[PDB]
Design a protein around this ligand. Structure first.
Ligand SMILES: CC(C)CCC[C@@H](C)[C@H]1CC[C@H]2[C@@H]3CC=C4C[C@@H](O)CC[C@]4(C)[C@H]3CC[C@]12C
Ligand SMILES: CCCCCCCC/C=C\CCCCCCCC(=O)OC[C@H](O)CO
Ligand SMILES: CCCCCCCC/C=C\CCCCCCCC(=O)OC[C@H](O)CO
Ligand SMILES: CCCCCCCC/C=C\CCCCCCCC(=O)OC[C@H](O)CO
Ligand SMILES: CCCCCCCC/C=C\CCCCCCCC(=O)OC[C@H](O)CO
Ligand SMILES: C1=C(c2c[nH]c3ncccc23)CCN(CCCc2ccccc2)C1
Ligand SMILES: C1=C(c2c[nH]c3ncccc23)CCN(CCCc2ccccc2)C1
Lengths: 167, 164
């Protein structure tokens, strides 16, 4: 019938947050959670992503990146079902301030991630021991997996600051 | 007035942040020749006294945060100082929430590294940084207020009745 732009974005936000739950549990937190909570097929799927996409941070996370991973588990993950509910339902003014908090937190998390992937040395002679992108194409093929987690928080932040239906 | 007392404190927090950012925090991002020799020696006194391994030669993740301090945070500092020094500025709430969560998120990995990383002959930091746990507390002593004060500002904006 009639699907408006506001309501389409809210459905999009619901699927972003519903999809983030398995992504966080089964892939992102492989570097902090014990391996034995994962079946071998899921651990080898984890290995496939790291080999194909040349990811230097997820499997063996540095301290700065490991601190963001514990924020994902302890702060972001409980919020994902609540935000999925609110944006699927659509009329929830009580999601404004928590969504802005999430959006700023996640955009700030991803600035150093994207800068490290674009600018740092991931060679054998580095501490990443060659498990990172070497070519400019390998850097941008990996950034492509992280960039929606900056941009979609950026869209959510703009939506929540200006939408009269949430203030 | 306890509400006004916090606003005066927050006002002096944002005012003092301006020189702290320009003359000290951005030594690794901005060029050496911009700074006079007396300011460069003062920066060296901080680095050596507090054994700071990040500020002078910033890693890429910390450097990205420093650029956020120059481009986003520093333009906000005078506007926030005015708002809280004057009071009655409900329009600062959503900006101050954004500033606070951004700076809290910035400080979590910094504080984590300073407290949980081995700086003892780690080729990562060229033999610099805190070695004992007391040296770690001494360094964190200058970073912790820039997490706790933003945390106070967040609760202030989210819960205080004037700022919704
Ligand atoms: C005299 C020595 C010690 C310090 C020199 C300070 C210089 C480098 C400072 C003073 C004011 C600063 C500017 C203040 C505000 C902004 C807006 C921001 O969006 C980009 C950076 C920019 C444009 C800053 C660039 C650096 C700057 C020009
Ligand atoms: C308060 C903040 C902390 C709590 C936040 C919520 C924590 C979520 C809990 C568990 C998820 C664990 C994920 C591991 C899933 C592994 C898959 C698995 O076990 O598969 C089953 C089996 O192999 C089939 O036969
Ligand atoms: C009020 C709005 C009602 C219509 C939209 C809600 C439907 C959600 C199901 C989709 C996600 C289910 C996943 C489990
Ligand atoms: C080798 C460099 C020596 C001095 C460089 C001058 C240019 C930087 C001046 C202002 C930047 C403000 C942001
Ligand atoms: C409603 C206002 C929207 C714009 C707010 C920012 C405007 C100017 C930057 C001022 C700081 C410059 C510091 C040098
Ligand atoms: C880190 C992410 C992340 C989001 N928010 C965070 N906050 C703090 C810390 C990290 C994050 C999200 C993206 N994720 C990559 C998933 C790669 C993948 C997806 C699907 C199937 C297989 C493999 C790495
Ligand atoms: C980094 C800081 C910081 C605050 N916000 C940020 N956002 C993003 C990135 C960094 C920061 C503030 C503290 N500062 C140390 C000043 C030590 C000092 C102060 C005064 C005189 C001499 C020496 C290091």
């Amino acid at each position: 019938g009639t699907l408006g732009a506001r309501r389409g974005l809210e459905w999009f936000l619901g699927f972003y947050f519903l999809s983030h739950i398995p992504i966080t549990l089964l892939m992102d937190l492989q570097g902090v959670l014990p391996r034995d909570l994962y079946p071998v097929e899921l651990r080898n799927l984890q290995q496939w992503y790291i080999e194909e996409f040349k990811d230097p941070l997820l499997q063996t996370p540095p301290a700065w990146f490991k601190s963001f991973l514990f924020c994902e588990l302890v702060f972001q993950l409980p919020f994902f079902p609540i935000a999925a509910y609110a944006f699927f339902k659509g009329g929830c003014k009580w999601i404004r301030t928590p969504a802005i908090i999430y959006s700023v937190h996640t955009m700030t998390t991803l600035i150093p991630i994207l800068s490290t992937l674009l600018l740092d040395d991931f060679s054998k002679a580095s501490h990443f021991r060659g498990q990172g992108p070497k070519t400019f194409q390998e850097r941008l093929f990996l950034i492509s997996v992280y960039i929606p987690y900056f941009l979609i928080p950026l869209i959510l932040l703009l939506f929540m600051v200006r939408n009269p239906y949430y203030k």
